[PDB]
Write a protein that binds this ligand. Structure first.
Ligand SMILES: COc1c(N2CCN[C@@H](C)C2)c(F)cc2c(=O)c(C(=O)O)cn(C3CC3)c12
Ligand code: NA
Ligand code: NA
Ligand code: NA
Lengths: 204, 212
């Protein structure tokens, strides 16, 4: 059977730079070949898009080792890249190469929102905090209700790297019952990475 | 070239069968070879099989031999993938693609969920907010099943400053939020509403953001 081995699994690359992805196959392709070799780019939530066909993406290699080169790397190239070998008996894909962009550090644009009148009518309470357009991905967030830290009923969710500014964003959601929410008044949303802890708060 | 339209998302009980379709338009629909690909959430692309509509020949990945059946309706220019004995491992996005030596196209994907859990619509709560240059608004959609759900702002007019976050699953329900950062001059001067679509429960909801 045809096995495709892609390397590296992930790639962190600076803008403007030259990035190369490899795919090795167990079934040699001659130039007149039963098989084909092609490259795909997949952005999250989208179909793979066929590549290569003075382009920024170009292919090389024949026989067993195939390379995809991106030159220069640009911001919206953040995606997973797949090689695909096409053959009459089977088609197969490589494991994928996740392409990460390197950029300068950035600080989150924090926002915090209180439960809505609609949700309070329902009998639940959700406090939502957006930490938008920061870099690097790894960020810890804590929050305190009138100074008291809470580890219960918090929802964290990260976006994919942005296609335009190469920054990550994140959404934290603290859910308490309606009645537990009424007891207190001071809610603060705290982000890390001068340390400069960014804090957003709302009262009552 | 060719364009491909896949059928909508499906929630199905374990042990049942589903048939998902890929409807084709354009020139020489008989000339393309149709194939199907599976992608589990966060996983790589997996070839299911192909069918050549010209001679009817088919080839399957050994892992789907028992599971999947590919057919083409020549009259209606529709390719089908029948999946049987469904279990949670069949929960995934399924792609339909067609190709010949001139051209290849892919469908948008079909999200299939194999679950005992019952369909549940989302609760949509608006999030309204300092006078900065820019203001951030938000939408919270909570307690829905299954995925997917679609959020747009002002029926798609606002796309530049949107952040829609991957849904997260708790108990048997999903929750996500999306945010829009907009210039303060524009809002509340211009109305900005959040549009939420839940195909599985056949519900669309529009919530205008309003300052408390
Ligand atoms: C539709 O794309 C192609 C494919 N591919 C693209 C990758 N997926 C496979 C299934 C079909 C093919 F398998 C071979 C050729 C060819 O044989 C060819 C040629 O000029 O000989 C050109 N193309 C188009 C340029 C990409 C081809
Ligand atoms: Na059956
Ligand atoms: Na053509
Ligand atoms: Na985004």
């Amino acid at each position: 059977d045809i096995v495709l081995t892609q390397s590296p699994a992930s790639l962190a690359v600076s803008l403007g730079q030259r990035a190369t992805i490899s795919c090795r196959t167990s079934e040699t392709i001659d130039s007149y070949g039963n098989s084909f070799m092609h490259w795909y780019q997949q952005k999250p939530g989208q179909p793979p898009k066929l590549l290569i066909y003075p382009a920024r993406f170009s292919g090389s290699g024949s026989r067993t080792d195939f390379t995809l080169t991106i030159n220069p790397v640009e911001a919206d190239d953040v995606a997973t890249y797949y090689c695909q070998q096409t053959n009459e008996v089977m088609y197969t894909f490589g494991g994928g190469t996740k392409l990460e962009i390197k950029r300068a550090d950035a600080a989150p644009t924090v926002s915090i929102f209180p439960p809505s009148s609609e949700q309070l009518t329902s009998g639940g309470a959700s406090v939502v905090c957006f930490l938008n357009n920061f870099y690097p991905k790894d960020i810890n967030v804590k929050w305190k209700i009138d100074g008291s830290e809470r580890q219960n009923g918090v929802l964290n969710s990260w976006t994919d790297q942005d296609s335009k500014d190469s920054t990550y964003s994140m959404s934290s959601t603290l859910t308490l019952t309606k009645d537990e929410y009424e007891r207190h008044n001071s809610y603060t949303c705290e982000a890390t990475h001068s340390t400069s802890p960014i804090v957003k708060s709302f009262n009552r | 070239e060719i364009q491909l339209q896949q059928s909508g998302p499906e929630l199905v009980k374990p042990g049942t069968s589903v048939k998902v379709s890929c409807k084709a338009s354009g020139y020489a629909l008989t000339s393309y070879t149709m194939y199907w690909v599976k992608q589990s959430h966060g996983k790589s692309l997996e070839w299911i099989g192909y069918i050549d509509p010209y001679n009817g020949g088919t080839s399957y990945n050994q892992k789907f031999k028992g599971k999947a059946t590919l057919t083409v309706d020549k009259s209606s220019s529709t390719a089908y993938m029948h999946l049987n004995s469904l279990t949670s491992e069949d929960s995934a996005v399924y792609y339909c693609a067609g190709w010949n030596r001139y051209d290849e196209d892919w469908g948008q994907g079909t999200t299939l969920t194999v679950s005992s859990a019952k369909t549940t619509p989302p609760s949509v709560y608006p999030l309204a907010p300092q006078t900065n240059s820019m203001v951030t608004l938000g939408c919270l959609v909570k307690g829905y099943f299954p995925e997917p759900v679609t959020v747009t702002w002002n029926s798609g007019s606002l796309s530049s400053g949107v952040h829609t976050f991957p849904a997260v699953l708790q108990s048997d329900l999903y929750t996500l939020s999306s945010s829009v950062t907009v210039p303060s001059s524009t809002w509340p001067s211009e109305t900005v509403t959040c549009n939420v679509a839940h195909p599985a429960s056949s519900t669309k909801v529009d919530k205008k953001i309003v300052p408390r």
